[PDB]
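User: Earlier you gave me the apo prediction for this protein. Now I'd like the version with silver ion bound, so I can compare the two side by side. Same sequence as before, with the ligand SMILES added.
Assistant: Got it. Here's the input I'm using:
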Amino acid sequence: QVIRGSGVVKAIDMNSKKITISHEAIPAVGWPAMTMRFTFVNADDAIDAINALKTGNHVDFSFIQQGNISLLKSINV
Ligand SMILES: [Ag+]
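And here is the structure of the complex with silver ion:
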């Protein structure tokens, strides 16, 4: 199940492959607004996140809860 959220990218770590997003509440899945780390898979998945980090723009993103990891699927910027 792909979950769509929005927020501001605050951090990226290319070693841990984590993107930190200050995301809005997601009432669909009962999450409040949080600053939370999402795992990305490919180095090239980071490019859109790096652009969002630079602008600080409020961006769309999507992720899947794949086991007990929040795995990023997209960030539009
Ligand atoms: Ag969260």
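For your comparison, keep in mind: The longest helix spans residues 46-55.
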